[PDB]
């Protein structure tokens, strides 16, 4: 039931062929009335030339094709369906999932007979019979520095971080989301699954107040850190970051949980627990890429690893639909779906949990 609908949208754009010319060719036709219709569509946009409803309909009246489809009644009903728009691609894939099959399946019928017909051959009957099958703009990352190359973290992206086991990326994925709720305004959703709500409170003050060379666990510090503290939790109320750990909530649930806040605050960022503890990945991780596109939220849906690209792109996606992918060892954004793909010079004190630049 793709074919009945598919053309309807292609019509009024005039650019619903950019991915569609990629997906469907003049072979991609289970049907008989449809095959020549699209060829009358394709002849148009080659100047091109311009693109509308009719530029095809009187083209069909010309070079031998109008009653072939049952008049314009169904030529109308090519349009009359698509009760949707926010999908995007999508859609023509249904036809391609009626397609791919037989380029890998119609190519196995001759063989089923190439034993009692081609009797009589054997080895060359393999060399060929197997061949066919295949066929600041731009909200900053907290910095004042990471603000001029790409800028943002703008309005919609998928981000997956992978550095050495549980380091400062553990801090950074969240140290992206610090100077947004308190020091400006925007309330940013930082949810968790590993490090609990009762595990992310004492150490933000380690990260804020000139207080961490002590430490803070004993209850009472030295005669200075209490004279210098009102930085860490005083404006936490008038800010907008709060912590959860619903053990390990699935790829649809948080996706359906970031709807309480999208109505309430507008939903600014979604710093998620590594998309690997959440419930081979070119599948499971493709339910947080598109939630960014509709929810209109930067979604930090992460990972847990050296760093290298097609190495986290190993057992799964990552080098594909997934957007910007940086590399902590210095922030090596050797991949950023952002334009200026580049490394920023940085450092770390490790004394007061505060990181450095140059």
């Amino acid at each position: 039931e793709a074919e009945q609908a598919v053309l309807g949208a292609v019509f009024l754009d005039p650019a619903a062929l950019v991915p569609a010319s990629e997906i469907l060719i003049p072979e991609d036709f289970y049907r008989a009335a449809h095959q020549k219709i699209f060829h009358a569509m394709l002849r148009v946009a080659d100047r091109g030339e311009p693109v509308d409803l009719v530029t095809v309909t009187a083209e069909l009246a010309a070079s031998e094709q109008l009653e072939e489809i049952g008049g314009v009644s169904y030529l109308s009903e090519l349009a009359d369906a698509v009760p949707t728009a926010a999908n995007v691609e999508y859609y023509a894939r249904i036809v391609e999932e009626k397609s791919v099959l037989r380029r890998l399946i119609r190519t196995a019928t001759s063989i089923a007979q190439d034993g009692y017909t081609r009797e009589d051959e054997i080895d060359v009957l393999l060399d060929e019979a197997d061949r066919k099958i295949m066929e600041i703009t731009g909200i900053p990352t907290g910095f004042t520095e990471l603000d001029r190359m790409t800028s943002g973290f703008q309005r919609s992206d998928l981000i997956i971080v992978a550095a050495r086991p549980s380091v400062g990326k553990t801090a950074f994925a969240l140290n992206i989301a610090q100077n947004v709720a308190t020091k400006t305004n925007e309330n940013v959703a930082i949810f968790s699954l590993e490090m609990s709500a009762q595990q992310l409170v004492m150490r933000m003050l380690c990260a804020e107040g000139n207080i961490n060379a002590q430490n803070l666990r004993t209850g009472k510090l030295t005669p200075e850190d209490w004279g210098k503290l009102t930085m860490a939790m005083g404006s936490l109320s008038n800010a907008g970051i709060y912590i959860d750990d619903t053990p390990s909530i699935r790829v649809s649930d948080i996706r359906a949980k970031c709807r309480r806040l999208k109505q309430e605050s507008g939903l600014g960022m979604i710093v998620i627990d590594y998309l690997q503890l959440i419930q081979e990945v070119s599948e499971i991780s493709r339910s947080l890429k598109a939630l960014a596109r509709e929810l209109e939220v930067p979604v930090i849906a992460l990972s847990q690893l050296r760093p290298m690209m097609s190495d986290i792109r190993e057992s799964g996606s990552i080098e594909q639909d997934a957007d910007i992918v940086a590399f902590l060892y210095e922030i090596i954004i050797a991949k950023q779906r952002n334009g200026p793909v580049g490394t920023v010079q940085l450092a770390f004190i490790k004394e007061y949990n505060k990181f450095v630049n140059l």
Partner: protein
């Protein structure tokens, strides 16, 4: 069987069969403006019977209401009418009602797209559809 018009026009009468602010902002949206022939015949005793200065409820508002407009008047109220009237049930019914005689020109323009048709004119009528397509939105 019953299309949309037999399942939208009835319980909104049974929503307001009860209290006031429910019944109030209705005729101002439905003059009317009543779609079905006799879905107006009862609307002479739906508004003009709080006009007088009544109080509430379908106790007497189940059949008063005359005779042939009774075998539905009783069977109007019976069903799920959660009187916590949805603010998202709002624009619907009255847009569902009022743009039916707006949409009703589509059981018309399709039919002058398909009248000049067989008599031999088609691809300027393959422009009537571009007209037809757009008001299918509302």
């Amino acid at each position: 069987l019953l299309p949309a018009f037999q399942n939208a026009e009835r319980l909104l009468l049974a929503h307001m069969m009860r209290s006031r602010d429910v019944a109030l902002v209705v005729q101002e949206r439905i003059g009317g403006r009543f779609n079905i022939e006799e879905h107006r015949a009862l609307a002479a005793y739906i508004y003009a019977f709080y006009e007088e200065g009544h109080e509430a409820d379908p106790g007497a508002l189940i059949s008063r209401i005359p005779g042939e407009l009774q075998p539905l008047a009783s069977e109007l109220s019976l069903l799920l009418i959660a009187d916590d009237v949805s603010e998202q049930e709002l624009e619907d019914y009255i847009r569902h009602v009022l743009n039916r005689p707006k949409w009703l020109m589509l059981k018309v323009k399709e039919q002058e797209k398909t009248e000049a048709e067989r008599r031999k004119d088609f691809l300027t009528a393959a422009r009537i559809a571009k007209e037809m397509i757009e008001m299918k939105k509302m």
